[PDB]
Amino acid sequence: GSSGSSGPTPKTELVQKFRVQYLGMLPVDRPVGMDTLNSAIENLMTSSSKEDWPSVNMNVADATVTVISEKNEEEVLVECRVRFLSFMGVGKDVHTFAFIMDTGNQRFECHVFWCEPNAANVSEAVQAACSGPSSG
């Protein structure tokens, strides 16, 4: 390592980590909507028990959503960005959070998660970042 080391700065950003479980990744056709959202969750929900879901952490910063493991603050299970997001919301139960992301090739992935006591702060912390129009 001939080259020295990078030079950090005495200033960081605000990050919000939330220990949530990882239900799994279910694809969806509609990048927007709740029905499908819930449907996705409910689908995953049934799949794999609750305890089966690995306790992960949801990092939120720089308007991004990165799912970091529990036994590793460096590991990045899933890396989602509010800029690549399409939609989301809280499933049937308030203890569930899923959002449709954009990967490319007309493909969308919905990452289901379990937040307690409710995915209100998470969804918000994530939404506050997304912050999109309603086009009503």
Solved with: NMR
Residues 6+ positions from 17 with CB-CB distance below 8 Å: 57, 58, 59, 60, 68
**Do 99 and 80 contact (CB within 8 A), yes or no?**
yes
Residues 6+ positions from 63 with CB-CB distance below 8 Å: 81, 82, 83, 129, 130
**Do 132 and 63 contact (CB within 8 A), yes or no?**
no
Third-level CATH fold of 17-131: PH-domain like (2.30.29)
Sign of the CA dihedral with 55 first, then 60, 65, and 68 last: negative
In the three-class reduction of DSSP (H, G, I as helix; E, B as strand; rest coil), residue 28 is classed as coil
Domain ranges of the chain: 17-131
Q: Omega before 54 cis (within 30°)?
A: no
What is the number of alpha carbons within 13 Å of residue 134 lying toward its C-beta?
1
* Partners of 55 in beta bridges: 21
